[PDB]
A paper describes a structure:
[name] adopts the prism-like fold characteristic for P450s, consisting of a large domain of 10-helices (C-L) and a small domain of four α-helices (A, B, B’, and K’) and three β-sheets (strands β1-1 to 4, β2-1 to 2, and β3-1 to 2). Our systematic mutagenesis studies on the promiscuous [name] and the versatile NascB identified four key resides, Q65, A86, S284, and V288, which play critical roles in controlling product regio-configurations and stereo-configurations. To obtain insights into the structural basis for regio-specificity, stereo-specificity, and chemical versatility, we further determined high-resolution crystal structures of wild-type [name] in its substrate-free and substrate-bound form, and of two [name] mutants ([name]-[name] and S284A-V288A) in their substrate-bound forms.
Furthermore, the double mutation [name]-[name] almost abolished the production of NAS-C, leaving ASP-A as the only detectable product (trace VI). These results clearly indicate that Q65 and A86 are the two crucial residues in [name] that that direct the enzyme to produce NAS-C. Comparisons among the three substrate-bound structures showed that all substrate-interacting residues, the heme, and the two substrates superimpose well (RMSD in this region between any two structures <0.26 Å), except for the mutated residues and the adjacent residues such as K289 and I87. The plotting of the spectral variation as a function of cWL-PL concentration is fitting to a rectangular hyperbola curve, yielding a binding constant of 11.6 ± 2.1 µM for the interaction between cWL-PL and wild-type [name], 25.6 ± 1.0 µM for cWL-PL with [name]-[name]-[name] and 4.81 ± 0.26 µM for cWL-PL with [name]-S284A-V288A. The [name] and [name] mutations result in a shift of the αB’-αC loop away from cWL-PL-U radical.
Residue numbers in the entry: 3 to 217, 221 to 398
């Protein structure tokens, strides 16, 4: 049986996804390379909609300790719950999450986000020679997003510790199992020592809103909130922004169009979310009872995966799916998922993506300083990221 994942750590998607999509079944059996667990895999848009909109396929049951899984180790510090955003929703914090992640948070932060994107790009444009868009643009912008909107102000050393923990824990391979587990322990212990300090600093970052919310969360619960915000917000935003910059630098005609027609930038943001691959794994859900999807029986307790990259490149949903085409008129993309677990970070993500696209579109001529095939990729990360993006004007 086919093992999962497909080791497509660069922007070139594994051919397996299109092979399975065109096969004679709407759901295909695979086996986790890291655990040996049997799993089901969906690659078609129409089938993915039905799965992800059926609440009898549960995300929490697939997150839970002991579930069949695609990842080699559990994504939690041993002895903690590690059950994700469910822990905060269950504590009654939906309103707080809306305040800290929703349109009001974007209104509060979009000004400094755009000012920072411009400041960073202006500094790079002042340099003689090449620079690295990953280290010199994405890292400072994503780190500021995390500090100012999610956690509170971090030192460089704290940011480096959390980034290392995320990169070490959120992996299919490349580190030992024990190193991966200990990354989660280190992050949890960091927040046990520092979450209350971070939550008490001035600002409106989400961790402060959580800590102050009238249910009072314990130190352990606040630490779990910190770890959630790191894993959900940091490697995702950094990986995506790097990947979106590569897409843009490889499509100078599209950038020129955005330079001339800034009103088209939002359409380019949405097309980047469809076109630019991020996760090398899949969203997943556990059948909470015996279910059927397009004729295939899924037994209670079995886990079904949807590859968002596969769905976003489904030719039955998008005409010429492998073409970057801002303004294409097709269905909604799956870059933020689908259904009740749709990314609650989507407003802040779109804000930072838009700020980046506009910073690039204002400065035509930005190009890669090496060929795309010369970009080196971190191998095995859940969320693709290049080691560097050499660039120049
Ligand atoms: C920047 C690019 C981002 C992308 C492309 C992205 C994408 C996604 C996707 C596809 C999901 C759905 C997973 C599933 O269905 O199981 C998701 C969930 C989630 N995202 Fe985002 N995300 C991004 C940024 C962020 C940020 C900045 C935050 C927080 C500040 C965040 C917080 C979350 C949380 C907490 C969930 C879990 C939702 C749930 O399980 O109900 N995301 N994200
Ligand atoms: O809140 C959650 N939701 C799902 C999807 C996910 C969203 N962002 C993630 C980042 C890494 C892994 C999985 C996800 C999950 O697997 N979870 C374990 C870590 C965070 C938790
Ligand atoms: O690679 C992963 N993706 C997320 C889902 C996701 C898909 N695309 C995303 C984009 C952003 C956040 C989460 C996702 C998830 O549930 N995982 C369990 C173990 C592997 C890890
Ligand atoms: Ca195509
Ligand atoms: Cl089990
Ligand atoms: Na459908
Ligand atoms: Na719901």
């Amino acid at each position: 049986t086919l093992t999962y994942p497909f080791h497509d750590w660069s922007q070139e998607l594994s051919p397996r996804y299109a092979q399975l999509r065109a096969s004679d079944a709407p759901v295909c059996p695979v086996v986790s390379e890291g655990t040996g667990d049997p799993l089901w895999l969906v690659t078609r848009y129409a089938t993915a909609v039905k799965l992800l909109e059926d609440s009898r396929f549960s995300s929490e049951a697939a997150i839970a300790s002991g579930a069949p899984r695609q990842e080699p180790v559990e994504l939690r510090a041993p002895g903690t719950r590690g059950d994700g955003i469910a822990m905060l929703r269950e504590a009654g914090l939906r309103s707080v999450l809306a305040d800290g992640l929703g349109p009001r948070a974007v209104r509060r932060h979009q000004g400094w986000i755009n000012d920072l994107a411009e400041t960073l790009m202006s500094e790079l444009a002042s340099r003689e020679g090449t620079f690295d868009l990953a280290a010199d643009f994405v890292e400072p912008l994503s780190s500021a997003l995390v500090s100012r909107t999610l956690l509170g102000e971090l030192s460089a050393d704290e940011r480096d510790l959390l980034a290392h923990c995320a990169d070490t824990g959120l992996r299919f391979c490349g580190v030992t199992h024990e190193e991966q587990v200990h990354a989660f322990t280190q992050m949890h212990e960091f927040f046990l020592e520092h979450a209350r300090r971070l939550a008490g600093t001035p600002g409106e970052h989400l961790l402060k809103l959580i800590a102050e919310a009238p249910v009072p969360l314990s130190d352990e619960a606040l630490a779990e909130a910190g770890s959630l915000l790191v894993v959900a917000g940091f490697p995702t935003s950094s990986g995506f922004l790097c990947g979106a910059l590569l897409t843009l630098l490889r499509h100078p005609d599209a950038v020129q169009e955005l330079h001339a027609h800034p009103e088209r930038v939002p359409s380019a943001v949405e097309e980047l979310l469809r076109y630019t691959p991020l996760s090398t794994g899949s969203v997943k859900r556990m059948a909470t009872e015996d279910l059927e999807i397009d004729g295939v029986r899924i037994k209670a307790g079995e886990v079904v995966m949807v590859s968002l990259e596969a769905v976003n490149h489904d030719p039955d949903a998008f005409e010429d799916p492998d073409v970057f085409r801002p303004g294409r008129e097709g269905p909604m993309h799956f870059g933020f998922g689908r259904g009740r677990h749709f990314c609650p970070g989507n407003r802040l993500a779109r804000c930072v993506i838009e700020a980046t696209v506009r910073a690039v579109a204002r400065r035509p001529g930005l190009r890669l300083a090496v060929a795309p095939e010369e970009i080196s990729w971190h191998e095995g990360l859940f969320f693709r990221r290049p080691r560097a993006i050499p660039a120049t004007w």
